[PDB]
Swiss-Prot record:
Gene assigned in the entry: SRK2E
Species whose genome carries this gene: Arabidopsis thaliana
Classification lineage: Eukaryota, Viridiplantae, Streptophyta, Embryophyta, Tracheophyta
Effect of residue 41 to N: Loss of kinase activity
Protein known as: Serine/threonine-protein kinase SRK2E
Tissue specificity annotation: Expressed in seedlings, leaves, flowers, stems, and roots, but restricted to guard cells and vascular tissue.
Gene Ontology biological-process annotations: abscisic acid-activated signaling pathway; cellular response to absence of light; cellular response to carbon dioxide; defense response to bacterium; leaf development; positive regulation of abscisic acid-activated signaling pathway; protein autophosphorylation; regulation of anion channel activity
Length: 281
């Protein structure tokens, strides 16, 4: 729905109003102090400001890892609460794959290492699964792109692990491993696994393949035995048997060329603003 007029024109330069994408209906602006490009999501003051929004905002604000799309600040308008966050201006990872046809094994590993670091961090903060848009990770503006995961944002069924389709109870972290595997596969192969590429809207078939873990790396795609093995260890239907993030962190494919590395807004101010934004002019 339509966005309120520009505000805070003394810290922010308005870059563009965008009405669709991963950041949805949002507002691109520039911080005049940092030179940083940020995105702003808007929620109408009033009832819409509820305990889920409260919990998402708090949780978002808590996350400080360079591969997570980070929370900047919350701002009050007379009609909306403004939530300012980092903007990934590099587009979707998927678009880069398509442009390249497929990635080399080394470029895939470069991104996959960032993916797993970000996911490992989220998991230790108890942010699993539904809190992460792992099916549509993004890239920053950098010439050498950094991976960016929207957590708490405000596709292909391939990303859905078999247990998520069949079982009543499941561990979300383990389902995340499956999803990472799918992202790895697509980077290497240039197409999703399980999904029939000439029939991508055939969800029945896709699901059948997911359940039976039926995938096949094309003959012309050549990957190391290490890489092939890691994939076979992620694409395991029984979640109890699936390789875990820690085990992935210790896998030899993952360790190759691994970079050793892998003053906000006060909680008082944020809670006070969320509170005030419950009253709806």
């Amino acid at each position: 729905m339509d966005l309120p007029i520009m505000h805070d024109s003394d810290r922010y330069e308005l870059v563009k109003d965008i009405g669709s994408g991963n950041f949805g209906v949002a507002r691109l602006m520039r911080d005049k102090q940092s030179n940083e490009l940020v995105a702003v999501k808007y929620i109408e003051r009033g009832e819409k400001i509820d305990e889920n929004v409260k919990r998402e905002i708090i949780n978002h604000r808590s996350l400080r890892h360079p591969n997570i799309v980070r929370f900047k600040e919350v701002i009050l308008t007379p009609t909306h609460l403004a939530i300012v966050m980092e903007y990934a201006s590099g587009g979707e990872l998927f678009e880069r794959i398509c442009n390249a046809g497929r990635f080399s094994e080394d470029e895939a590993r470069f991104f996959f290492q960032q993916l797993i670091s970000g996911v490992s961090y989220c998991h230790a903060m108890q942010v699993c699964h539904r809190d992460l848009k792992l099916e549509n990770t993004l890239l920053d503006g950098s010439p050498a792109p950094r991976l960016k995961i929207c957590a708490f944002g405000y596709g292909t069924p391939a990303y859905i692990a078999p247990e998520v389709l069949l079982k009543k109870e499941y561990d979300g972290k383990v389902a995340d491993v499956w999803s990472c595997g799918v992202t790895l596969y697509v980077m290497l192969v240039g197409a999703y696994p399980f999904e029939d590429p000439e029939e991508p809207k055939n969800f029945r078939k896709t699901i059948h393949r997911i359940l039976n873990v039926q995938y096949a790396i094309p003959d012309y795609v050549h990957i190391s035995p290490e890489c092939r093995h890691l994939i076979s260890r992620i694409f395991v239907a029984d979640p109890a048997k699936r390789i875990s993030i820690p085990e992935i962190r210790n896998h030899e494919w993952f360790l190759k060329n691994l970079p050793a590395d892998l003053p906000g807004q006060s909680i008082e101010e944020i809670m006070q603003i969320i509170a005030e934004a419950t009253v709806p002019p």
